[PDB]
Amino acid sequence: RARDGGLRFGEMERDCQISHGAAQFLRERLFEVSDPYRVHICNFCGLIA
DNA sequence: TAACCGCCAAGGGGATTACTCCCTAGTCTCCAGGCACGTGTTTTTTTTTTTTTTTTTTTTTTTTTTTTTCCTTTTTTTTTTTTTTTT
Ligand SMILES: [Zn+2]
Numbered sequence: 223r224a225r226d227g228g229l230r231f232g233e234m235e236r237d238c239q240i241s242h243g244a245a246q247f248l249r250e251r252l253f254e255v256s257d258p259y260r261v262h263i264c265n266f267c268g269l270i271a
Numbered sequence: 272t273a274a275c276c277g278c279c280a281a282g283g284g285g286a287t288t289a290c291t292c293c294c295t296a297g298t299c300t301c302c303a304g305g306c307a308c309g310t311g312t313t314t315t316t317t318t319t320t321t322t323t324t325t326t327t328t329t330t331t332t333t334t335t336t337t338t339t340t341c342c343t344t345t346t347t348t349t350t351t352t353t354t355t356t357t358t
Contacts, residue, residue, distance in 0.1 A: 223337070232334060 231256075 231251050239248050264271040 230335065234334070
């Protein structure tokens, strides 16, 4: 709380959300509101360009 | 005390001569086990793959949340400047 940190979306949260089977909440909590990024990738090599 | 010698007596069987006979020496003639040559099938050796247990390695240990405390080098060797003594 002193560093103003968010809650821990742990393993069993992903387990019970897979049990509910709603993919959009998983895509929100684990990609949209945690650490989104955009990278550019070469098509032939498949690595970071 | 009976070995040994001398003397005498008796008899038993090996040597001798002749007749016989029969078994083997010798000589063909057929054929068959004895032997020279080739080889085997068990016996030992060597590989080969597995087995079975032991040892080693590696990975694991429910989740979330909130406060402090200590530390986040250190000695040890080398260098470089400074100070003092001498001619
Ligand atoms: Zn490329």
